[PDB]
Design a protein around this ligand. Sequence first.
Ligand SMILES: [Li+]
Length: 252
Amino acid sequence: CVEEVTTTLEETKFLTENLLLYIDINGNLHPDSATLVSDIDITFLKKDAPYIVGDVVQEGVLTAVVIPTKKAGGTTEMLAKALRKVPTDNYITTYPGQGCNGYTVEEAKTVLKKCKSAFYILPSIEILGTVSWNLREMLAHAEETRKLMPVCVETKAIVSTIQRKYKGIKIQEGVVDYGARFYFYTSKTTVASLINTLNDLNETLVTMPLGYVTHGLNLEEAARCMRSLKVPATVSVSSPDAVTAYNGYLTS
Ligand SMILES: [Li+]
């Protein structure tokens, strides 16, 4: 009932056209699902928001289910309960509950072995060492390695430091390659959208944990989100004790 495939989305459609996508209660796509809806109208996902966990929406070849997140009380049984609402069918999908939602692959496997449906699981397509580097250190590293450095534009202390270092830089949201290569973002976009952007750019990162403070996440919550990155990243945390903490959060 559950089979992992080695193929891309397009290379897996010969088995079924149906895609199972994961959304949150506002109808926003999980980063694992967000890359699967090219050239398809997805207005229907958010049109009927807000949802509750377990709600299912469908249009054409797409099915989407609202899954729980452990930051908001979610457990393994609530994940299983949510997936039971999906109509029985054959689907291409990803393992439910990964990334920010905080479930492990082994937990996702457990949920899907209930298998009213058949699922073909797309491949999740390298872990650089976690460090505790200050902003000056992170900038110098970026400059010489050409790694992409995400920066939250609302963090005034960082923006001013960059302006001093790189006289003449015009900081604006998006990629800015001046002195070093930056991805400037607002906390007024989702963490998922930022992760998908970084994954699409397909560059190695030097970064603080994404969502941590800027999007109200604690360190464990950010570490869960960081699992959705598909690019290598040097992750710089607040202190040496946080290195130990972060690495533990990432592996559970
Ligand atoms: Li973005």
